[PDB]
Homo-oligomer: A and B are copies of this chain.
């Protein structure tokens, strides 16, 4: 514990299909079958990222995410962004900054294993692996490529205050992700919703996989204009919203 201070590395088991399962929260980290496509639909689709990028009136796009996990959302976004830059080299938007929080960071071995699930993503994955920081408290910035990733280790509820009033109205999209509310209820607070709301740029967006009613009412109370949207595949319902 001089080793880690208060941080606990993730405890994973790989299940019969080879999927990473969190032993901290008792759930798979992603869909073995549909993980990439689902991430694209929920977080890219829900925040309309692909449509927005060529019309974005600033040189920087800022994404903030509540639970990093395996980094699937991030890698998916980085691919999408890279694809956007190839198709639109002369757009106003030139740079991406991603800010994420994680209470139980994966070890580098578990991380490499998780990523083997997505060979399409390997070029970006291998870059994240190469700079994967030690599980210590606070902000670890990775300079990739144009693309910056800030990884905050610790508790998002205690951490979010560190994003002081200087970051207000600077987040273009929120990935409200991590384990389900029934699996990790501690993450899903009014404190968090409120902070998300103050960090959001006007017209900035949020998406989440859950439609738990308290989560919708909590975001609405924080100040987002929320709507339901069909879930991925056979799933009925997800939530997304816009500031103002």
Contact = CB atoms under 8 A, between A and B. Distances in A.
Interface of A: 1-2, 5-6, 60, 62, 97, 134, 136-141, 150, 152-154, 162-164, 166-167, 170
* This chain's copy number in the assembly: 2
Listed from nearest, the 9 A-B pairs whose CB atoms lie closest are A138-B138, A1-B166, A136-B139, A137-B139, A138-B139, A137-B138, A6-B164, A136-B141, A134-B141
A72 to B, nearest CB: 23
13 contacts: A1-B166, A2-B62, A5-B139, A5-B162, A5-B167, A134-B141, A136-B150, A137-B139, A137-B162, A138-B138, A138-B139, A138-B153, A138-B154
Contacts of A170: 2
Given A137-B138, A138-B136, A164 B5 contact: yes
Q: In this complex, which of A139, A141, A167 has the most chain B Cβ atoms within 10 angstroms of its Cβ?
A: A139
A2 B137 contact: no
A2 B97 contact: yes
A58 to B, nearest CB: 12
A2 B167 contact: yes
A5 B137 CA distance: 15
Contacts of A2: 60, 62, 97, 167, 170
A62 B2 CA distance: 9
Q: In this complex, which of A5, A152, A162, A164 has the most chain B Cβ atoms within 10 angstroms of its Cβ?
A: A5
Q: In this complex, which of A2, A136, A153 has the most chain B Cβ atoms within 10 angstroms of its Cβ?
A: A2
A2 B59 CA distance: 14
Contacts of A141: 134, 136
A211 B141 CA distance: 40
A95 to B, nearest CB: 11
Nearest to A136: B139
Nearest to A60: B2
Nearest to A148: B2
A162 B6 contact: yes
Contacts of A167: 1-2, 5
Nearest to A62: B2
